[PDB]
From Swiss-Prot:
The record's note on its domains: The chorein N-terminal domain mediates lipid transfer activity.
Substitution effect: residue 70 to K: In Mutant 2; abolished lipid transfer activity
Protein's cellular compartments: Preautophagosomal structure membrane; Lipid droplet; Endoplasmic reticulum membrane
Reported impact of residue 34 to E: In Mutant 1; abolished lipid transfer activity
Organism the protein comes from: Homo sapiens (Human)
Origin organism lineage: Eukaryota, Metazoa, Chordata, Craniata, Vertebrata
Quaternary data: Interacts with ATG9A (via C-terminus). Interacts (via WIPI-interacting region) with WDR45B/WIPI3. Interacts (via WIPI-interacting region) with WDR45/WIPI4. Interacts with TMEM41B. Interacts with VMP1.
Protein name in UniProt: Autophagy-related protein 2 homolog A
Gene that encodes it: ATG2A
Length: 438
């Protein structure tokens, strides 16, 4: 007999979401490792409980039916680890403030879990219904965190829930509006896609929902980010919810690897063929890099950094063929054993914030004022592919598509270069201790 003995129960019904553990469209066949084989399919975050007095006239589209059997129901009360057939649900409502506050209020132990298939979450900030269907299995506006073979280990150290989560697979995040113009990350295997510590939303780590989410993903394999339409289409969707169309946390995002295939494309957005700047630019199979540091609030009062490091990365840039094909920096400098390497630093400051000595100080002052940036420290790169032309190709690309890339961020910016040895391939480079400014 399909004993239906479950419904909405007492719970902290959030402002934006209704706390109602509903087992809908499921034969709840229940027949200290106490197992009651069940079907919790149908848990729905219909949500919209705050707007328009629950918005009863228009219930939110984000709803889940048959969201995972979870039949095994491993373990019982005592580290309440559960081996399940349901991965997770997706709060398609704003995953910055409302969903974060709901999660923080609900969490207010060290339980673990082991899901199956990595539901295709579509938190946008019936797609969430697709996420629920994928939990049953577990162009744009297609933000998807779907580890096909979910190796999620929800550490969930609630002891102020200093939670954690280590996975062996990765998502595919086409992050877009509410032309293949978004990122296309395809990390997949554990080292190949070592997704780690995705969310905290707990007052213990930080004191949005006080995340302090050190998502220091440390992978060491291909994990190709095949396409990346823009860096900016990334600051807007992170500070604001999202303002694209068809067209107190401190997010410390660290990433170190010997090898991680990657594509970097500039940001030329209408709000602030393809983008003009750096046509066909690829930091191919370079070091993983692209480590960021962001914040939920728009116009970050603290500055935003974006670092990079690489020993001899074979980044085919502006590819015909790279104008510079390897960092090639064997430049020991200090008294101790040192090996200098390249870096591409970025330092963005909020909009409307607040010659050995002449040329240096003038552009230092110009660097203290930021509406965009760019920075390079190449010790001995000096490189160029055998197919390259400093006379022609560099002129045709890195001088035309250089500053006309919608330079503005929240067009007073700066630029530096520094080389201890240079080679202008094709011819008298003669370069030692040289720079370039703008």
């Amino acid at each position: 007999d399909t004993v239906v003995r479950v419904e909405h129960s007492p719970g902290d019904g959030e402002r934006g979401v209704a706390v109602e553990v509903r087992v809908q469209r499921l034969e709840y066949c229940d027949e200290a490792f106490l197992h009651k084989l069940l079907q919790l399919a149908g848990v729905r975050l219909h949500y919209e409980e705050l707007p328009a007095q629950e918005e009863p006239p228009e219930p939110p589209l984000q709803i889940g039916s048959c969201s995972g059997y979870m039949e095994l129901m491993v373990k019982l009360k005592q580290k309440l680890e559960v081996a399940g057939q349901l991965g997770s649900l997706h709060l398609l409502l704003t995953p910055r403030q409302l969903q974060q506050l709901q999660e923080l209020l609900s969490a207010v132990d060290s339980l673990l879990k082991m899901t199956l298939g990595g539901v295709t979450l579509t938190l946008l900030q019936l797609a969430t219904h697709f996420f629920t269907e994928f939990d049953a299995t577990k162009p744009c506006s297609h933000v998807r965190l779907t580890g096909t073979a979910v190796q999620l280990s929800w550490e969930l150290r609630t002891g102020r829930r200093t939670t954690s989560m280590e996975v062996h697979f990765g998502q595919l995040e086409v992050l877009e509006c509410l032309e293949y113009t978004e990122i296309l990350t395809f990390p997949g295997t554990r080292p190949c896609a070592h997704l780690r510590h995705t969310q905290i939303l707990r007052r213990v780590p930080k004191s949005a929902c006080h995340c302090h989410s050190e998502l220091a993903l440390d992978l060491a394999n291909f994990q190709a980010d095949v396409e990346l339409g823009a860096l900016d289409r990334l600051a807007a969707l992170l500070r604001l919810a999202t303002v694209p169309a068809e067209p107190e946390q401190q997010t410390v995002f660290r990433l170190s690897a010997p090898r991680a295939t990657l594509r970097l494309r500039f940001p030329i957005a209408d709000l602030r063929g393809q983008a003009v700047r750096a046509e066909q630019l690829r930091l191919e199979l370079s070091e993983p890099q692209f480590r960021s540091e962001l914040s939920s609030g728009p116009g970050p009062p603290v500055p935003t950094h974006l670092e990079l490091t690489c020993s001899d990365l074979h980044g085919i840039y502006e590819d015909p063929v790279p104008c510079l094909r390897v960092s090639k920096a064997l430049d020991p400098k200090s008294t101790g054993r040192k090996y200098f390497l390249p870096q591409v630093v970025v330092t963005v400051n909020p909009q409307s914030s607040s010659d050995p000595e002449e040329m240096r100080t003038f552009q230092s002052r110009t660097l203290a004022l930021s509406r965009c940036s760019l920075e390079v420290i190449l010790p001995s790169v000096h490189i160029f592919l055998p197919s390259k032309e400093v006379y022609e190709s560099i002129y045709n690309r890195i001088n035309n598509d250089l500053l006309m890339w919608e330079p503005a961020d929240l067009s007073t910016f700066s630029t530096l270069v520094t080389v201890l040895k240079g080679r202008i391939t094709a011819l008298v480079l003669d370069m030692e201790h040289g720079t370039l400014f703008s």
